[PDB]
Amino acid sequence: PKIVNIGAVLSTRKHEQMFREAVNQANKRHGSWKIQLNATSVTHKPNAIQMALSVCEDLISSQVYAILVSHPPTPNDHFTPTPVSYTAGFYRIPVLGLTTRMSIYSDKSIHLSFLRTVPPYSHQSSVWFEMMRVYNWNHIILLVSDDHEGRAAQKRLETLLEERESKAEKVLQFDPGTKNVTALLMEARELEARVIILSASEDDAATVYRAAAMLNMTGSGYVWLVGEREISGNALRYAPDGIIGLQLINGKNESAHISDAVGVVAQAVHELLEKENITDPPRGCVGNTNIWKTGPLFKRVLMSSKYADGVTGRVEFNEDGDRKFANYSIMNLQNRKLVQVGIYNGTHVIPNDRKIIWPGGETEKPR
């Protein structure tokens, strides 16, 4: 009866409980004959020192094969995984994030021991790419954050725009923390195109919306295309009517992602302990300066795993650990109410019977 520990850092005590269930439920699902999956976990810490310290003292110390990182889906939490990733990445222990959508985790270096059940915001540009053409606009204005996250959605959208009739036109970028995006929009206003795509924080989207309206870029022939987040929080409070944003279906549904992540990890642990040339994970974090050799192997099996019937539906991973084929519900601001006017899944936009109102009030697609 081989005991295999699985660690998680989660939001609440009830989620710790939800994890303990989902694990030993998936334990009976697979078969407790050969291996028996064990759940050990800790409540999340917002203080990234105290957090990194907990991953050693509470998780890695008790022989863990992989860690799940969860936290409140708030914009001043979306980085509580960085310490966990760095600490566990030290020994090559795969970290399975399930809330955070920050693109820095999907980079080709730094977070090499990381994968997630939810796509980064930079992938919302794959929807915008389909959106363009479905509604036949193909000359756009683009403004991104000029922090990593912003350029990550620019670099992507513009890659898809290559090889294609549609071109970038003019890419503009602002300093992340600014009030005063006036002279930047002022320059965009006199430009050719009037379908604006935005990538910003909740409060930064708010600042451009606020200043866009003050410069009369808010209505008529203008189209505003954003993602989720640019229609969350204060961004919603100051958004122009007729803006098109997105929302990741099941994105904030933490109980779902605990269920699916335990799904793939259980499924991939059995897959792993079949190879029979594997080492046990280190119980270290104390003068232990060596990795476990079968670390990255487990990580490769992890992110090449295929797992349909998931509660977030058909969960498989990226070239570098991102969720593949995720469902975004297309949103639209009609009279201060976000109404589902479409739905993107994997690829392709599929609108419903309900009609879109465009920025300014006038129905019927602008140019």
Next chain:
Amino acid sequence: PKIVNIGAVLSTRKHEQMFREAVNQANKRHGSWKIQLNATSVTHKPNAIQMALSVCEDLISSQVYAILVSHPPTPNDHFTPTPVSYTAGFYRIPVLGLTTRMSIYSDKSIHLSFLRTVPPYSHQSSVWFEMMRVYNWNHIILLVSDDHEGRAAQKRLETLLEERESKAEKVLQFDPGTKNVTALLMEARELEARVIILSASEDDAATVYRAAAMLNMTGSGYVWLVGEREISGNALRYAPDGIIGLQLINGKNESAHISDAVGVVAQAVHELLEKENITDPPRGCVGNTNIWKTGPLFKRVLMSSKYADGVTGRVEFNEDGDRKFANYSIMNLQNRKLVQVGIYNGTHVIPNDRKIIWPGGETEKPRGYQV
């Protein structure tokens, strides 16, 4: 020929060249017939995402043996090495700290590729213990911030007090960054002990200094014994006359450490290349998830290295993580002006000629102890 690369993250463009010259000088001093030291460096980055990325794209990408980390010595930059230590720790490349004194880096098991030519703030408790040896304080209230830093200072002082017939008369901890301390200091004032040891951030120190001056804990009987930081910035603007604080000699001196680090990294890299089974450091960051097995070795070489005639004293690193063992200087607040009233060698507190006015303008030494 044979080129050996050394990385560095430093404060300015002119500190970068300061580093490059120190590497060139280390070659002209060492052998340099077999191996020739080289200098690749980047400037420091506040934003921790951009710093981690720079360590990969600029430093690790240039096949680096060890990375030096410096930065402005502001209380806002003291954490800048965490992304460097994590990113380079990922491959077991040794990171050498020059300016940060945060105690978290000294920890067992969080930063295992980290070195520093400067001791942590928690080590100031070694100085306070000696301050109590001289000046016979045997009854103390010790208030520390209830974070890792404050707790690190109380754990080390309590250890030192344990192996002696003593402990803190009472230990008090406040929530880092609170603006109400009035309550805590109330139960402190009614105690027997009258010498107060504080371990707080520079802004937290000011909060307690005025909450203390108000409940009347500044005059006469009291002794205020703190460390650097509790006498820096907003603290010291609000610190009571007669407060005694520490100041790490050549702590804020970048060029002095840029030199000494290059010195010991040069001294140790020669030692390493003297050995059998040495593998080259990782070429790049991208899609690379193996370490270099000699990384841990090289770090153990670095830590057991000795270096006399630094500029900053005798350079050597202890076992715990690694931290220098060298001189501090005792400062006293007189007429709102910090004047040196003593100096601490590696071991003993040794008073100077200059006389020392205690809290509340008092001329002669108090004893704490209720009076």
